[PDB]
């Protein structure tokens, strides 16, 4: 898309020196994802979002936002599964008539009863271009959102390798890169822009709004991290 230069990656140290708290980002990837299996939207706020009557903790619905109306219309009124990262501060979800609730981007795949062996994907992690480990994540979906993968991966690294901590990280910068079978690739900067203080969740999570879907069986995942 193509691969980032070091100097273009967001820095943990810049985020801290702008008085930001990396714990906001930690909590998105440590707390559980929104999940729903075979659900159908109950309503909409704007024509590029779909409101789903799924439970998350004490919330009774989630608004998921798509990048444009046609993408929303691709899923509207259909049986889908939902998997994504919710936020609450800045979430705007008007009631059916009074304002806050649970929101997310993207997250959607068509529900399929022919979709039942878990696949394993090995995430390849490289640090400072010099040490590797891999771990594996699973999903039972043949066609999976990139969001689902990204979350499963960042969640393991946050819990096990200090990807995000309350006030920083074991790293200074990094990105996660996905490679599809046809050989093209894209990446996300793992860290928040230094300007994003206070942390405003929708501006970080809108990367999922394109509801990019991939084939579990063939997708390649690589993380690259730099220490300070």
């Amino acid at each position: 898309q193509p691969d980032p230069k070091l100097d273009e990656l967001n820095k943990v140290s810049d985020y801290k020196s702008n008085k930001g708290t990396m714990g906001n980002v930690m909590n998105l990837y440590m707390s559980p994802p929104v999940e729903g299996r075979g659900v159908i939207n109950s309503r909409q706020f704007l024509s590029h979002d779909l409101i789903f009557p799924i439970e998350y903790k004490s919330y009774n619905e989630v608004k998921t936002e798509l990048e444009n109306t046609e993408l929303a219309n691709n899923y509207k009124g259909k049986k889908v599964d939902i998997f994504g990262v919710p936020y609450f501060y800045t979430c705007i979800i008007p009631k059916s008539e009074n304002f806050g609730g649970c929101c997310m981007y993207g997250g959607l795949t068509f529900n399929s009863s022919e979709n039942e062996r878990d696949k394993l994907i090995t995430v390849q992690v490289t640090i400072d271009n010099r040490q590797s480990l891999g771990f594996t994540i699973t999903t039972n979906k043949n066609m999976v959102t990139i969001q689902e993968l990204d979350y499963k991966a960042r969640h393991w690294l946050t819990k096990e390798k200090k990807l995000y901590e309350f006030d920083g990280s074991a790293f200074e910068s990094g990105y996660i890169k996905f490679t599809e079978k046809n050989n093209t690739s894209f990446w996300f900067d793992l860290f928040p822009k230094k300007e994003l203080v206070p942390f405003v969740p929708y501006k970080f999570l809108n990367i999922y709004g394109d509801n990019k879907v991939v084939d579990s069986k063939s997708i390649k995942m690589e993380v690259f991290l730099n220490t300070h």
Binding site: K19, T21, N27
Partner: protein, 109 residues
Amino acid sequence: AAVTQSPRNKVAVTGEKVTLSCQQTNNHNNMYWYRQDTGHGLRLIHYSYGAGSTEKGDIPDGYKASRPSQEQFSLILESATPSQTSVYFCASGGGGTLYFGAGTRLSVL
């Protein structure tokens, strides 16, 4: 009560992990943890604008916070130090209004 804190009194030893809990009944979006010290009045440690949000106040060093739901805002001292001896006050707020809890006295030995 608008805002309740627990515990109300706490004696800890240096290095001990201590969590102070604040729970509100107002459905306010904003919550705050301050400490009160002679010669400073209230100083803001961390605050929150909603569930999953916490941001640094003026004296955040040595403290973490967590806002796991609308109702609850926790202040976490991972490794208590004597400089953390103080009386802590939590507040909730929504535009115009602020309600404060009754205070938590922490001595760190």
